[PDB]
Amino acid sequence: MGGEIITLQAGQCGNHVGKFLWSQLAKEHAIGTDGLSQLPDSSTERDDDTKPFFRENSRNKFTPRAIMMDSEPSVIADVENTFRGFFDPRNTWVASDGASAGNSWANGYDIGTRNQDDILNKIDKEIDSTDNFEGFQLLHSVAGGTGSGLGSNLLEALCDRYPKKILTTYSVFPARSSEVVVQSYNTILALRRLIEDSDATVVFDNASLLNISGKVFRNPNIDLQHTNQLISTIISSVTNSIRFPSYMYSSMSSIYSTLIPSPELHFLSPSFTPFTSDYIHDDIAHKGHSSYDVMLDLLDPSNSLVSTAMNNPTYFNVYNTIIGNVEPRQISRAMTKLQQRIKFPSWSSSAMHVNIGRRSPYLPLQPNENEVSGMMLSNMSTVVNVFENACNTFDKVFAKGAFLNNYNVGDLFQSMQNVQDEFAESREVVQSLMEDYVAAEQDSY
Amino acid sequence: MGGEIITLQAGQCGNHVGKFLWSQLAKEHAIGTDGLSQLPDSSTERDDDTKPFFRENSRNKFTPRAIMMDSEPSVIADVENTFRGFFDPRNTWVASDGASAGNSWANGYDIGTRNQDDILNKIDKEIDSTDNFEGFQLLHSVAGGTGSGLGSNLLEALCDRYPKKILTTYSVFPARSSEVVVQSYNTILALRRLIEDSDATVVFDNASLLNISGKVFRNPNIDLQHTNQLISTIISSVTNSIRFPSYMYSSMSSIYSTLIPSPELHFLSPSFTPFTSDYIHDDIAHKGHSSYDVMLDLLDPSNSLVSTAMNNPTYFNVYNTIIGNVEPRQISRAMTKLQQRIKFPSWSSSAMHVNIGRRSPYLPLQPNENEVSGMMLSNMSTVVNVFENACNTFDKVFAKGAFLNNYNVGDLFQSMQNVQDEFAESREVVQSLMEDYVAAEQDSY
């Protein structure tokens, strides 16, 4: 409905994906770069938005309901841009020492703990402003100092504070062709929080992701902004069915039921086609529905490391396809109906026939070639691989002793490494259970 | 027609003939030299010459589907003249390294490799914008460095990437008394690639082409530019029945299949009279239909060298005559039937009589001074003599150790002297095959 969602932007990564997101929304809902209300333009019949994600000022300036947390560089970059109106200084909460682009989970955890009140004050204002609160979204990286450590501190406080409200995360998991080995410390400490304190993690695995930014966008040199533009296109597309009326995928309850199939398996992998959507650097992106969709099933175009389809599980627990048209609705409609009936995944006792569609209109108000797009959000057994590679990485760094110094400064490691062990035991139980879904032994009655 | 042809121009000569070619087609349909949209028949389609060679970009004016490639001199000349409206800025490419080819195949070849991605981005755009591309036509000379080395390089990629798309070439082969000494080297090294990597090659022997241009169309100071005027008349005419409505059920591929029996017997010979058709030189002629037809079989008039007299022991495999005249259908038809029967082009048992004729009338808005004129395309097994000459001349220059200098800087001729030798052996195999086509022993029973 119009119910509010409060957006939490954490670390370098969150602020960078977030700025692009509001820009992209803005073109779409026909409003200026500072969020000013345009009167003959429509944004309240074409969309619900300009109240779910935005709020109105007394001088009639819409601003996104977002709370920005991180250090100084990123808050300073946005105001220098014209995208300044999407942010406000009161929304900005700024540290000066929880910084690091690289992995330094502890440093971040600890700073959050010092300034618990200053943040909780920000959070309380945003909740007090809500009319009907749906829930929270955290945008971050679990590869930052700032995005990683602090973001996971905040999830534990939000879990405790509210148990029946949705917590969704778009979490960037640290790449495994990286040049740092502290990646393991961040991934393990965060991953505990990400399963329990949050109800959904949409995994973006940077190794695959970075290559998608490299090949398609054709960047001349790679930077944080670049990769983060790729993430803003996928993120905007996932929300399309919410934002448009005449679809019952707008209510809070109905999104949660469809998407989350166990309170323990709720690890999501994205695929999107075409990836460009308002940042086209490519000769063409205009294509029939069939190419896009057939490609959406494929594990080859994916932003997370779900690897290829050979020597890997093919067992999909759920599949959700989110549909965008600006070409005949009937051809696409008929096709979705056929796709569910055909059953691309394998299926056993546990579940069967789990293919769902959400239908949305795509808007050409974005720079496009009059392309049709779609997004896949899927819950797949192949996702266990990612955790596995982390387990292997964690052991090697344990042995070496490399750069424990920052970590001990943090609360978790001065309170022994018993917590980590406890987590390891729980986590393996989660992977074994996900493997079982593959077979016919999960449902046996 | 609705079957598109994409034109490739390589070298000094390829861009020159190309600019002049486009000026000709523009003049013929009563439009501008920048390409303005001002067809008198857009309301019933008696113009279809504004679509197998031109594309619409919605800039209110048609532009030819052409990509121009070389060094700096030719591209500066095209831009300087008002035929610059046929070329978007992306269509003009300047890219030279080691400071032009310098009349060296090995340098020329090497320049294409570095900026390989740049060329492909142009090829991929042009194919994707097209409704349905039949295949490619290359305009270039095998006499330079650039025309040869880059033209060959582009042919090898095209064959490999797309094996199901036809590559027809218009290759200008140099003079056989030689105008530049190093031409013979370029011709061998390019001709090897031309043979394997091309599906069809139309041989234009420059020696012959030049003599005709000086004698028949006068003008003090023949140069490249006069001689290219003759070539632009030829290129226009070979497509004539497809681009005009007279036929439209013919296609590029079926014309190619019938003329070309095997990919090591794909050498076509032209003959032409008056040697313009659609005037853009000077001199008008009128000579009877019987006389006009008789002259076409004859190999003394013709824009390539091959042994004199009709009826050869290295027989005509197949003959295509493209008739252009505004006189009744009945005379042309009665004459193509007669021509096959009389045996002016030799024919054999165990290969059948294969003589086809295509008929066209010339545009009503092309200068009215017309006559019975035609172009001949035949695949005749006497072509071999041009190739042999250039090989004999090549080995003599090489033996002296003169003029080896230019090549040596490029890696390909410095290492791989194998190629020249390869072609000589390759030419003997081809000869053997041409000979079997006469007899029943062209495949074993």
Side-chain angles (χ1 to χ4, degrees):
Chain A
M1 299 80 75
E4 291 54 65
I5 296 180
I6 298 180
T7 290
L8 304 177
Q9 288 178 224
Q12 270 184 92
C13 188
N15 294 47
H16 297 161
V17 294
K19 71 195 180 72
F20 299 129
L21 187 69
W22 317 134
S23 301
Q24 186 166 5
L25 279 164
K27 298 156 196 296
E28 276 180 282
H29 309 306
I31 36 180
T33 59
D34 286 301
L36 304 173
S37 306
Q38 288 175 286
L39 203 77
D41 282 313
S42 314
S43 332
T44 55
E45 24 169 61
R46 309 202 205 145
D47 286 301
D48 290 57
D49 305 80
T50 63
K51 166 172 192 301
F53 299 132
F54 306 75
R55 63 181 167 102
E56 186 178 81
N57 290 338
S58 270
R59 57 191 164 207
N60 303 269
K61 188 182 71 174
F62 302 137
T63 182
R65 312 171 183 238
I67 299 180
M68 292 80 67
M69 301 187 181
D70 58 4
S71 54
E72 295 173 276
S74 319
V75 308
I76 300 180
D78 186 67
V79 292
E80 183 177 83
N81 298 305
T82 181
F83 299 151
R84 56 189 68 150
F86 296 152
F87 283 178
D88 286 276
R90 169 62 192 159
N91 294 336
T92 289
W93 169 87
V94 49
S96 47
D97 283 305
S100 275
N103 290 263
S104 280
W105 191 113
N107 284 133
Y109 184 86
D110 202 75
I111 190 180
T113 304
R114 295 176 201 161
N115 300 90
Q116 188 73 35
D117 56 291
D118 295 79
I119 68 180
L120 191 38
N121 194 275
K122 309 269 164 298
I123 302 180
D124 281 16
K125 190 159 183 58
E126 291 296 292
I127 296 180
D128 287 330
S129 297
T130 63
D131 296 296
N132 191 51
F133 187 37
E134 300 193 62
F136 293 102
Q137 176 200 106
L138 174 53
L139 298 183
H140 67 151
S141 37
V142 186
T146 332
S148 201
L150 184 50
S152 50
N153 178 269
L154 184 49
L155 288 172
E156 296 181 85
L158 304 170
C159 170
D160 276 74
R161 201 180 167 182
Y162 288 98
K164 296 307 193 183
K165 290 303 171 187
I166 186 180
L167 266 282
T168 203
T169 60
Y170 292 94
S171 301
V172 186
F173 274 30
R176 315 297 176 185
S177 289
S178 68
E179 68 188 293
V180 310
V181 296
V182 276
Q183 56 116 317
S184 302
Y185 301 136
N186 292 46
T187 296
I188 276 180
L189 292 171
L191 193 53
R192 183 191 171 119
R193 290 57 173 181
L194 282 169
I195 297 180
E196 84 185 340
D197 298 322
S198 298
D199 296 293
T201 172
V202 169
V203 185
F204 297 134
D205 205 88
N206 192 248
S208 297
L209 181 62
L210 186 79
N211 195 68
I212 298 180
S213 296
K215 82 193 185 53
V216 184
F217 274 26
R218 315 131 58 96
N219 300 307
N221 44 270
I222 204 180
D223 284 290
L224 293 299
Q225 306 290 333
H226 307 160
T227 297
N228 297 340
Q229 280 165 65
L230 205 286
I231 305 180
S232 70
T233 53
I234 294 180
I235 298 180
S236 106
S237 310
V238 171
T239 63
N240 221 9
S241 309
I242 328 180
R243 295 168 36 200
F244 276 95
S246 295
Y247 303 107
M248 49 187 81
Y249 295 118
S250 295
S251 46
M252 165 185 174
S253 194
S254 284
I255 307 180
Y256 194 146
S257 296
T258 307
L259 303 182
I260 316 180
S262 310
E264 181 195 11
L265 302 178
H266 47 267
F267 312 105
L268 291 132
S269 312
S271 308
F272 180 34
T273 292
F275 306 109
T276 55
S277 296
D278 67 308
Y279 292 116
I280 189 180
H281 291 294
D282 291 282
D283 293 327
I284 213 180
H286 177 39
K287 64 209 302 161
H289 299 277
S290 303
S291 298
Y292 83 76
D293 286 289
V294 175
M295 285 176 188
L296 282 175
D297 305 286
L298 307 184
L299 311 188
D300 310 301
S302 295
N303 308 296
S304 54
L305 178 60
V306 290
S307 307
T308 199
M310 186 45 77
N311 292 302
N312 294 277
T314 47
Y315 198 102
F316 289 69
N317 293 282
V318 182
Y319 179 85
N320 195 45
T321 187
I322 298 180
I323 300 180
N325 69 295
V326 76
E327 288 185 284
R329 55 198 291 153
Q330 196 66 226
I331 307 180
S332 196
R333 176 91 73 177
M335 195 192 160
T336 307
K337 306 174 167 177
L338 201 65
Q339 293 180 274
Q340 307 165 4
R341 302 318 187 298
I342 210 180
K343 293 179 164 177
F344 302 108
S346 321
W347 307 113
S348 293
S349 294
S350 313
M352 52 181 61
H353 194 58
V354 206
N355 299 306
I356 314 180
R358 319 177 182 196
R359 297 197 61 78
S360 198
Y362 192 69
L363 295 173
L365 294 152
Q366 293 175 118
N368 289 319
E369 298 289 315
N370 304 271
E371 72 196 75
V372 292
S373 46
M375 180 73 197
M376 167 275 227
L377 270 175
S378 80
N379 302 71
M380 195 183 171
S381 294
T382 203
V383 179
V384 295
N385 197 31
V386 194
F387 314 138
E388 194 50 52
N389 291 336
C391 185
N392 301 158
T393 54
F394 179 68
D395 285 319
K396 284 189 284 300
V397 72
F398 202 129
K400 289 191 201 73
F403 194 34
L404 296 160
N405 301 272
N406 59 306
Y407 298 101
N408 53 259
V409 163
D411 288 274
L412 272 299
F413 277 84
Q414 63 191 354
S415 297
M416 312 173 161
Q417 303 186 40
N418 295 1
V419 185
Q420 293 183 118
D421 302 307
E422 184 246 268
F423 172 58
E425 191 196 320
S426 197
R427 178 175 53 181
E428 194 271 314
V429 169
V430 185
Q431 297 198 63
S432 63
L433 198 57
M434 182 150 239
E435 194 91 37
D436 197 279
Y437 268 77
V438 178
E441 300 292 285
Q442 193 53 225
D443 200 18
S444 60
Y445 311 118
Chain B
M1 58 183 284
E4 286 63 73
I5 306 180
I6 297 180
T7 306
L8 306 166
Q9 293 159 31
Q12 289 76 239
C13 162
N15 284 213
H16 287 318
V17 61
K19 38 173 163 293
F20 287 126
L21 181 69
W22 296 146
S23 304
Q24 204 187 316
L25 293 179
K27 191 169 48 57
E28 275 186 66
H29 327 308
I31 64 180
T33 57
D34 292 75
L36 297 189
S37 288
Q38 62 184 359
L39 296 307
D41 283 286
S42 38
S43 304
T44 194
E45 305 292 305
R46 186 232 56 193
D47 285 296
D48 286 73
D49 313 94
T50 52
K51 55 177 65 64
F53 280 120
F54 300 69
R55 55 186 304 193
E56 193 51 90
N57 276 291
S58 307
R59 42 170 59 209
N60 301 307
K61 52 178 277 181
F62 284 106
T63 48
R65 305 181 186 257
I67 297 180
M68 267 178 167
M69 285 182 281
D70 61 326
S71 321
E72 67 283 306
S74 303
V75 298
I76 298 180
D78 177 79
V79 184
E80 204 188 290
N81 54 53
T82 196
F83 307 130
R84 49 185 184 194
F86 294 147
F87 294 96
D88 291 63
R90 181 186 61 71
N91 294 328
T92 37
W93 205 63
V94 60
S96 309
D97 293 82
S100 304
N103 299 294
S104 187
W105 180 85
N107 293 113
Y109 209 100
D110 280 337
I111 297 180
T113 308
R114 300 157 174 147
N115 32 83
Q116 64 185 315
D117 294 301
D118 292 35
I119 299 180
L120 295 178
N121 197 61
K122 305 180 297 178
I123 303 180
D124 281 11
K125 172 60 203 302
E126 182 69 72
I127 59 180
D128 281 71
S129 57
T130 302
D131 297 79
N132 65 103
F133 60 124
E134 309 180 299
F136 295 91
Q137 293 188 342
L138 170 64
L139 303 188
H140 62 164
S141 189
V142 181
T146 302
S148 83
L150 195 63
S152 297
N153 189 53
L154 186 59
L155 295 157
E156 204 194 44
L158 284 154
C159 75
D160 195 273
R161 298 178 269 166
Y162 289 95
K164 293 182 65 57
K165 290 288 171 181
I166 40 180
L167 285 36
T168 290
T169 62
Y170 293 97
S171 305
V172 163
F173 273 90
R176 290 173 63 186
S177 302
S178 313
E179 290 176 288
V180 161
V181 200
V182 304
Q183 303 181 140
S184 294
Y185 292 77
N186 308 100
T187 311
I188 300 180
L189 307 161
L191 186 59
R192 198 282 188 160
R193 273 66 179 157
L194 271 145
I195 66 180
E196 295 178 354
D197 313 327
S198 200
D199 289 306
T201 189
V202 183
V203 176
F204 283 118
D205 203 68
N206 201 225
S208 198
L209 236 172
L210 169 61
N211 291 172
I212 295 180
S213 283
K215 297 165 185 291
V216 326
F217 291 121
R218 304 175 186 207
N219 181 43
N221 295 306
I222 308 180
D223 317 294
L224 184 42
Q225 313 301 117
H226 209 196
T227 304
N228 284 142
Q229 285 179 52
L230 217 157
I231 305 180
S232 59
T233 45
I234 295 180
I235 304 180
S236 185
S237 57
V238 287
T239 57
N240 200 283
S241 310
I242 55 180
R243 51 176 191 97
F244 189 90
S246 49
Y247 296 134
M248 205 175 298
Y249 299 94
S250 35
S251 54
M252 191 179 177
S253 303
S254 294
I255 294 180
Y256 158 89
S257 299
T258 292
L259 279 154
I260 298 180
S262 309
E264 285 166 281
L265 288 86
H266 56 180
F267 299 90
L268 290 168
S269 294
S271 203
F272 195 22
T273 47
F275 285 113
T276 176
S277 288
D278 308 285
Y279 307 89
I280 185 180
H281 295 96
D282 57 309
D283 310 278
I284 312 180
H286 303 94
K287 61 177 185 183
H289 185 53
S290 296
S291 290
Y292 146 47
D293 278 277
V294 166
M295 270 296 168
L296 283 180
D297 303 84
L298 193 75
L299 316 170
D300 292 296
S302 49
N303 292 289
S304 190
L305 287 161
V306 269
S307 291
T308 62
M310 60 183 173
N311 301 296
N312 288 343
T314 26
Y315 90 145
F316 280 64
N317 292 270
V318 57
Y319 187 119
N320 174 230
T321 157
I322 308 180
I323 295 180
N325 53 36
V326 295
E327 303 187 302
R329 288 66 55 218
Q330 318 169 47
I331 45 180
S332 295
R333 177 211 296 142
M335 293 292 306
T336 57
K337 199 168 176 183
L338 286 154
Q339 192 181 92
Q340 186 174 22
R341 291 190 296 189
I342 195 180
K343 294 178 183 178
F344 289 167
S346 46
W347 297 118
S348 301
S349 48
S350 316
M352 317 322 155
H353 280 61
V354 287
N355 188 303
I356 170 180
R358 314 304 295 153
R359 192 203 152 271
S360 69
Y362 288 172
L363 286 288
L365 290 304
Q366 189 267 138
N368 287 157
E369 43 188 5
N370 308 338
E371 62 139 329
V372 281
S373 54
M375 159 72 171
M376 183 197 98
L377 282 155
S378 67
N379 204 108
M380 172 176 71
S381 306
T382 327
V383 274
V384 185
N385 73 48
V386 154
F387 311 150
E388 178 175 59
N389 192 97
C391 213
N392 287 311
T393 48
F394 152 64
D395 56 50
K396 173 182 182 174
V397 192
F398 189 67
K400 293 170 194 170
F403 295 115
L404 202 86
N405 48 281
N406 303 283
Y407 297 74
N408 297 136
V409 290
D411 195 70
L412 293 143
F413 196 68
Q414 167 68 254
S415 181
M416 282 178 208
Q417 288 284 52
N418 300 97
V419 171
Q420 307 108 259
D421 286 282
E422 195 61 69
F423 152 78
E425 184 195 302
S426 295
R427 185 166 91 243
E428 305 307 289
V429 168
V430 163
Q431 276 173 43
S432 311
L433 281 163
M434 285 183 163
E435 175 52 59
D436 51 77
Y437 244 90
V438 89
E441 286 290 295
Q442 35 176 203
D443 178 64
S444 289
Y445 194 79

